[PDB]
Structures are given as C-alpha cells and as structure tokens.
Design a protein around this nucleic acid. Sequence first.
DNA 1: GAGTCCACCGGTGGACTC
DNA 2: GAGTCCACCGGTGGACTC
Lengths: 335, 334
Amino acid sequence: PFTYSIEATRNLATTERCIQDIRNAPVRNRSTQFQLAQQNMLAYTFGEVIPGFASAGINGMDYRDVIGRPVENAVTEGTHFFRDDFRVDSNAKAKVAGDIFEIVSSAVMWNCAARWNSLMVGEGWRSQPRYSRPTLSPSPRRQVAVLNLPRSFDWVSLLVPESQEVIEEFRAGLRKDGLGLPTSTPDLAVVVLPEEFQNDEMWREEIAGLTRPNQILLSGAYQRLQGRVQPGEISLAVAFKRSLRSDRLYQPLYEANVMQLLLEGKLGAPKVEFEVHTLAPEGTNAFVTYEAASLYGLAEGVHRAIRELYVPPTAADLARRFFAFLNERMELVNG
Amino acid sequence: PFTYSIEATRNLATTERCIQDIRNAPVRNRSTQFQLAQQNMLAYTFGEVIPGFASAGINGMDYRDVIGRPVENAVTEGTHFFRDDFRVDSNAKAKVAGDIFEIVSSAVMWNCAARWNSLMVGEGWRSQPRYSRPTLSPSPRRQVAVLNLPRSFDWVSLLVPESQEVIEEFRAGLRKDGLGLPTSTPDLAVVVLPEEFQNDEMWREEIAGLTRPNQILLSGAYQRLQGRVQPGEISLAVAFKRSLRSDRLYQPLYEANVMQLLLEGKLGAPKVEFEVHTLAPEGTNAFVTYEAASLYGLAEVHRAIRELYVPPTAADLARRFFAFLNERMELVNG
DNA sequence: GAGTCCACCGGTGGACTC
DNA sequence: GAGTCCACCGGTGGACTC
Ligand SMILES: [Mn+2]
Ligand SMILES: [Mn+2]
Ligand SMILES: [Mn+2]
Ligand SMILES: [Mn+2]
C-alpha cells in the first residue's frame, strides 16, 4: 500500500515483489543484481491510491514525496529480504522514478478526465474528493481523452488519415532532397474524445489504483484513438521530467516546435498547447529556456513553443490545474 | 602518461592525483567520497599525447579506448592507493568521460587548426604525422580558431557588436510579446581567425599535450574572439556526445535551428554547419533524427545537423576536419 | 567556505521479437 | 531467455558569486 507494510509485502507472490533478484539469472552485459520492478511497485504503492483522488493526507502531501514513495518502499523490501546484499544503482532509481512520475501524473490526469467527462455527459460533478465544480456548460462533444504515449510512439499516428496524408505529402517533398521532419512524441496527449466514443463508459470511470489492469488500461489507451483525432483536437501535450538539467530541456521544446510547424502551419489548427511538468527545476534557467518563441511561426508569420513549465506542489494541484485547463480550453469545442 | 605508470603516479604532488579523497572534506550535500580529478587525469593521461598527433599506434587506436584511457588510469590509481575503499559512482565516470571526449576532441581539432593555419600563412605543411596536404590555396585570411566553449556560454557573445545589436533588437521585438529567443551554445565553434590575429603565432602552434597550461590555453581561447567574429565566419559548430540516447539528441538539433534562424535568417550568413560527434550511436536512430530539415528554411532548405559523425580513431577525426576545412574555406576569399 | 549553477552521460525496466 | 530498442534522470567536477 502507500505506506510500506510487511504483511502486504509477504502477501505478494515472488513475481509481484517490487525487488526482483536476478543475481543467478542476469541481464547479459549488465552487472544488474536486483531489479526495481516498477509495475509491481506502482501496483503495491498505488494499488489502492490515485493521488489527488485519495485521502486528504495524500492529495495534499508534497508531490515529490508521493512520486518517491514507490522507490522508498522497494528499497525497504529489498533491505528486509536481502539486508546488506541489497545494491541498486542510482540510475535504476533514476529510471524508475522518472517513469513513476509520468505514470502517476497521467493516472491523476486520467481520473480528472473521467470526472470531467462524467460531467460533460450530463451526470453529476463527483465530490469525494472535492474540487471546485467547473463552470463551462456541459456537452458530450467536449469530453477529453488522456493518452499516456508509449516509448517509440509517433504522435502523428493519432491523426485521421486525411491529416496524416497532408504531413506525409509534405515530408515526401523533403525526402527527395535528403531531408526529413521526423516526429516522435510528448509523453502524454490529452485529446478530444472522438464522437464515435462519446457514449463509451470507460472514459468516465475514475480508476481506484494503479493495479496491473489499470496500468494496462491506461498505457494501452492511445491504441483506441489512433487514426481518430483531428489536428485541432490534440488539446494538450505534456512532457514529464522529474528534475531538470540544462541539457535535458530540449526534447519537448524541439518536439513542440515540430507539432506547431505541422498542426498549426500545415494543418491550420489553433495554438498547440505543450507543457513541461517537473518536480525539481534547479534554478530558474529552465523557465527562461521555455519562453522561446515557436520557431516555425517566427520565421514564417506568434506564440511560445512551450506554454509553461509547471512545478506541481501536490497531486491536488495537478488535478486543479488540469480541470482549469479543460474548463478553459474546451470552450473552443462547440457543445 | 597514456599507459599507466606507478612511477609517474608516485612522483605526482598530492594535489595532482587523479583521485582526490574528499571523505573528511565532504562536498555540501553529496555522498561522494573520491573525486575523479578530470583536469589532473588529462594532465596525466595526455600530458605528452594529443591523439592523432602522437604515435601512429595512438593515432590509429580505437577512439573509444583513447577517450576511455583516463578513467581507466584513474581507477588504477584509486584502487592502488585506497585498495578496497575506492568507490566511484557510475555518474562520475559518466561526467568525466564526457568532458574528456569533448576536451580531447577539441585538442585534436586545435592541432589541426595549428597545422592548417601554419599552411595558410606560408610555412608549408607539417608532415609528422602524415596527413593529406590540403589542396586549397594558402592564405592568411583562411586561417581558423577552434574554440571549445565553456559551460554557460552564449554563442552570440562571439559576434561583432553590429551583429549582436541585430539580435537584441529582434528579441526586444519578442520580449514585448512575453516571448524570447534564448541562445545557449554548441560545445565548440570553428571561426575564421579575425584579421587582427591572422599574424599571431599562437594559432599556428600545436600543443604537445594537455598539460594544465595547455588545457587553459584551449579552454580560454574563446575570450579572445568574443566580439570579433562575423556571422558568416562561424564555420562549424560541433556538439560532442560520447554516447546517444534517443532523449539526449535534441539540444544540438534545437540550437542548430536557433543558430540557423539567427545567422542565416536575420544576419544573412550562409548555411550554418553544425555536426554531432559520438562514439556510441547504437540503440538509437539518431541518424534519422538528424536528417530533420532546418525549421527556419521550412518557414522562409537544408538540414539543421549536417551530420552525425562517429570518429573511429583520432587520426580519422584529424583527417575529417582537414577534409572539412579544405572544402569549407572555398567560401573565404583568401 | 558555503552555496549555486552548468552540462556531462550510462545503467537502467519494460516493450518487442524470435 | 537473449537480444534489441527506448527514454528515464541523478550524481557528478569545475566555474562561479559572495
Ligand atoms: Mn508516455
Ligand atoms: Mn518525460
Ligand atoms: Mn565546450
Ligand atoms: Mn556535449
């Protein structure tokens, strides 16, 4: 559970344990002795808790401490079972922490999407826990989907074929002269739910935890939407970075710039909203970096590439910021 | 020296050791116990060896073990001196192995400039080690400076003020909109040697090795050209990245784009040349990533990044840069 | 000395394929 | 299980300000 528990932990099967001893069955070409089982970790620590949608103690807790709990629980497990034999590299803890930050934050934005959708579809505004009721007038045509995008994803595969053919035509044009414009992905995309699904129920059900099924439910979600989204219906893009360094700033800025070149400049959509979430910005230089104008719009004919760098204090605040974003962004979508 | 020597290690002053025990002088907030003294490590390993300008064995040696040599020598020192206590985080090795890649590569490029420059200026073509006498026609006006740029640098600071005013006016434009266009820096720039220096001997001398004074010479070199470089006179920008990860590819792509927008777009420079050197592209496909078109081009066309180079040996890096200079300075009326 | 910033990258856990 | 790929980031050594 969120708070470590020796019993909860002995209840776990060997393959469900947050630490996976691989000393005697090793990743070839790696010294890795113990594996941080991040899915197992999300399961144990957040099996019953979606921060922002849980106890007041957790929703109001410093988000850094929320995101860090999985690794602390795993570290405890490892110490119980292996005592001073327990060694994980800091890069292990780095990788897992980054992935937890993204997944949990996505999960919180998922539940926000549920509650908002439920409201848009003329049901109630739920209220355990309580969040100031959104003011925008409901309509099922402005439900949103929260898509944590997978490793390797190409966000272009979200777009309706007609939009994809526009980009493909444009890139084939470049490829003849040995040039390109590859797209990768933000970590997460909030998109306007396709009509065809506006009556589907999964998009309105808040999950209770990041149990393996719900992890799957969440990380598979993008599949349901591939090929179905209009250019102007990609509402928000997010990059998660648990901490920043000056060198680790650029992937979102670059990708936001390309999203704009393509969605705005080639497909006539409105401002592409792309933001960066961090728990540890390490000075103020990132905030200045992200004041950069969108390059495409500059050199042609104007706003910033990255709308904001957000440092969520608590899960509740991330939930609040997103509702607020939806209330405000979804009034470009007609009821 | 390059090959580890217990002798040479014991004759080092305590402040010159490659490993610095900081267990009882612990760094504010860090559990680090021993530091990889990278400047000492370079003094030691490459004190008398600039790869590509040393023995043919080192020149033709696989660049990864060249660049890996200082860390290996440091671990040797730490284990001999602190036995079972010597522990160093992976991330320390990571950091130092990175700066070493960059510093040493910039030192190879420095010596190529020195030979190049010495040719341009009439003194003929040095010949140990052997490289292909560039074919282009010598001229003091086609000399170059190789500027390893320091952490925190703003490459605009290299431009002549007239060029810098154009940019600041452009950003005042934007600042009024709640906008900016911040510039950072490539890891290194090659600029046309300013006329006022084209007779200075220091730009024609090849360093024997990365002694500390030589490190400071190379790392300080940019101060001297600050404010003197015309936009078109930024010949090459290089980002060094010892290895790649798909997320670690974008700073130089982005900055290439910003440079291209500023220099080509607002200052009328030619195509700005910007490459990325790596020793380890595998597991990514950065080659595809770096085929991206310049976003300026597209708006108002060429690649942002001219190439991902993977130098197999220091000799090849020397060779490629001679090849490059020989071609790129057709543009300069010498 | 004490504190802050800068930019370095390699060891990761999981998706994917046989 | 063995191999590849993908995108995670935190622990660094040195320059800096005071
Ligand atoms: Mn994702
Ligand atoms: Mn991320
Ligand atoms: Mn540099
Ligand atoms: Mn670099």
